[PDB]
Design a protein around this nucleic acid. Sequence first.
RNA 1: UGGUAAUCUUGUGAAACUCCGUCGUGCUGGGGAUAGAGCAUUGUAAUUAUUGCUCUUCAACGAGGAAUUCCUAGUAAGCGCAA
RNA 2: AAUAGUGGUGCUAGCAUUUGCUGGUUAUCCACUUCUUAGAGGGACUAUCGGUUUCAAGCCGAUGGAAGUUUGAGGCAAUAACA
Lengths: 135, 103, 206, 37, 63, 143, 127, 63
Amino acid sequence: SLVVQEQGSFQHILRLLNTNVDGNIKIVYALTTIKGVGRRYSNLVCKKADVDLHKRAGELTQEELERIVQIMQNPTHYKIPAWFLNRQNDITDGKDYHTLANNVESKLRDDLERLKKIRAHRGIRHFWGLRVRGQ
Amino acid sequence: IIKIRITLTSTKVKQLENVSSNIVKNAEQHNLVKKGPVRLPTKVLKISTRKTPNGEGSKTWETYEMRIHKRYIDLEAPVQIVKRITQITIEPGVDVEVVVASN
Amino acid sequence: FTPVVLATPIPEEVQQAQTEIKLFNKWSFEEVEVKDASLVDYVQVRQPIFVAHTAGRYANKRFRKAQCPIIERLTNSLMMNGRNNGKKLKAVRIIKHTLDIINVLTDQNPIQVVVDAITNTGPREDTTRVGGGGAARRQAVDVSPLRRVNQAIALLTIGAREAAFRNIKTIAETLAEELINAAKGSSTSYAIKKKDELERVAKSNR
Amino acid sequence: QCRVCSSHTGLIRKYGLNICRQCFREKANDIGFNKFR
Amino acid sequence: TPVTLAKVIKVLGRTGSRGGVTQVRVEFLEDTSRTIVRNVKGPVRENDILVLMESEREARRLR
Amino acid sequence: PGVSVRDVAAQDFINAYASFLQRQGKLEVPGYVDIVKTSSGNEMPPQDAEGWFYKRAASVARHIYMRKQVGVGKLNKLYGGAKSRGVRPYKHIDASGSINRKVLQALEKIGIVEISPKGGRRISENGQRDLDRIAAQTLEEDE
Amino acid sequence: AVPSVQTFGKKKSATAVAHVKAGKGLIKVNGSPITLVEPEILRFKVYEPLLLVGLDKFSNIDIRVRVTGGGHVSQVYAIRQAIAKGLVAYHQKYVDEQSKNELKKAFTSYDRTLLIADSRRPEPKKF
Amino acid sequence: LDQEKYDRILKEVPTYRYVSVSVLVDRLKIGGSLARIALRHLEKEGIIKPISKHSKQAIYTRA
RNA sequence: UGGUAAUCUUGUGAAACUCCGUCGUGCUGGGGAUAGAGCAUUGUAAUUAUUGCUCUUCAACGAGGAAUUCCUAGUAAGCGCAA
RNA sequence: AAUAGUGGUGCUAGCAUUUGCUGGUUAUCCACUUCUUAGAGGGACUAUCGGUUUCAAGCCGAUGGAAGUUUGAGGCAAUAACA
């Protein structure tokens, strides 16, 4: 195509909720480095971000790093269907949310520990597997 | 005086060329309109079963076969001509059918 | 030469010298080059070729094996493991993408650069494939010419796979540099420097 | 069904005949099956 | 280099633990009166050209 | 000096045609084109962000050209892939139907292809005087 | 009426019927010109019957062939079986035999399997 | 991130014999698409004398 | 709706392969092995997931020591997905 | 040979058009079997030449030929301790 030569300004470390991104890659591959979001999930949000689909970290506008979590923290606000989510129709509140990197471990232990010890709403013979053979 | 159709689907190929000959024989001694005996692709049946009553031994199998041949003739004649001759061409193992389909 | 027309609109460029006695769509067979006296008999099948792909019937007597073309033989050897058994169409794409990259590397005839190359790589001497009856030794022996050409081509081929395994460069980039390395006596390519040391210990053992 | 010869399994459900295959090899003749190849 | 340009005349038989080598009768082109055998390995027939190095030291027969 | 549909390129003829259709913009493009892929067997929505909807809609007209009729079950069993199952062996692809149901209906609005009495949707003289005529407009792309 | 004949060529259960007519010279592979066959590398295999005798004898011909069966590779071999033997039926019904044999010798000097199809059918396994 | 894509390529192009993706990846910073876009820019520049090209590879030499 | 059978499903538009692209050699977009949230169907009944589609998670695994092989020229191997 | 197929005559749409190349379908009708299917037969015997051998049984080349590895692959064939 052509030779575009920008003045570096590229961040080897990012800060999106304790996620430090080696941003010399495609931005849809940049978000996949966090947990809870993969290329089947991160595909549409950059298409929702309405940017170029080939950029690196050295050329991103500074509002967009706020924007990408803003669409993330408001998932159903900007036309995300029900079949595009992780956590769905919860046993505690029934609502539907998605998860970031450092909190997939949230709604994980407490939701298994009831099946581990309390003989919960369904977990009474699902009670030894992650306890005796897979603890 | 109606166009008819006869089928015969048997499994003794020697005993199907005598019948299909005398069908076209007595029709042509009365010289009706006809079209020749169209011979269809035959059908074979098969079942693989291994060759032991118990299970203890080496393994390869059988393969059984059964062959079905089928051919059919169309015809037109007055009904008095045909209703006698279809009752004198009987033979065991052989099936005969009459179809008068004139839609 | 007088491009006639039909009801089919036919392109001229398939008719210019192709209707003339030049046969292959970019090269010819006028260039006949003999280096060894062994290769005079069977390797240069003097017949035309256009695509280097036909259904040869040579595998039912061991000397009709000789009459297949050389270019057909090297494509056959490209089926190497359990991923390319039967991908002949992939192979001819590789080969017709290698003579182009030969002739642009400062030379004169892309079919020449392999027929001289196999003159070097037909091993003049040999070990024996025997132990000896306990004393695992190696005795005096020589090689038949029709056996000589067989292992000559094949050791050139197998070096290219690891030469193009897991590195950025492609197959056609390997086959370019390998054959011009094989064209001269350099012993810098793996296609050469494993047949040499075979012959050197064969100069010992005997 | 269990037909005869210590079998309720390996039945030949195909072609609508329903024979235990231990007791098919001895009955396949008179049905009109024969081996040829 | 000391070449030895040779031509096979008569085929005799295979010999070896497996018969993997064959003893033939070969002729030298540059001296057409050189009757000599050679333990050639490979598919062999009449009228072949044989590169060779050691023109005299050769096993006349094998076990 | 006059051609049919049958004597042009295959891949290139779609490209010149859909780019003209890219200038048209007369397509009911639904909202969920960003999310829903072509089938289940594929892994990703395509690298084309926009023109893929022009791509499939062009070639489905290209396939009813030689044919008599097309239903919907046929182009389900058509679309070029192999279903991965993971560690288990493969199986053939079957394509989704909602993304083909409307795009077949999206050409009745522009007079191309309509229902035969035999039971499939086919071209009539609407396309047979125009779709060939704009296939005749691809003859300018031959030079 | 018009000089017209039929030939056919097979390879590995893939047929290729041929219709020969007389005209300006159109060579139609299943309703398309011959210069568009999708194995682009094997495009010159079909050119081989035409590019052996010169482009002369075809302002009085018309060729329409159609195929069934086989894969994407055998059908390239099937069409040039019927086409090459399709030309000789003119020269074995209308034009003389000295014109026949000169191209008969020209074909079979170059390819025995341009006139006579192969005989290498498959084989049943673990039976 | 301004000069390394500016001097070794815009000036030192015609030094070689031919051009492929092999020469362009000799720098460990010029990645796959970066080496790909090099010829994609240079074909507009007319230095490339093309020989053959398809989707897997091209055969390109300089002017 | 069509199909008791060359008529209908069914040309069983199978896959590898085939062009045009994107990708760039790092165990990365190779490889998805344990998993949690969900929607469906089949029967009297699927928890100890009978199976199937969603999104997540991506963990052993860089060609294999000593040893040792149902498969023969349209053969050996890949590629099927019919009963 | 409307339970296969082409070849026309048509109704009929494109048609660059201008002779033309693609369509059109029940029944527009007639004429056809090459391809297709199934009955009846034919065809290969190692044929014909050249070597080789006790000149014997045969084995190697050769050109012809749809076919020249028992022409390719199978089915079928009873002496015996697995109580």
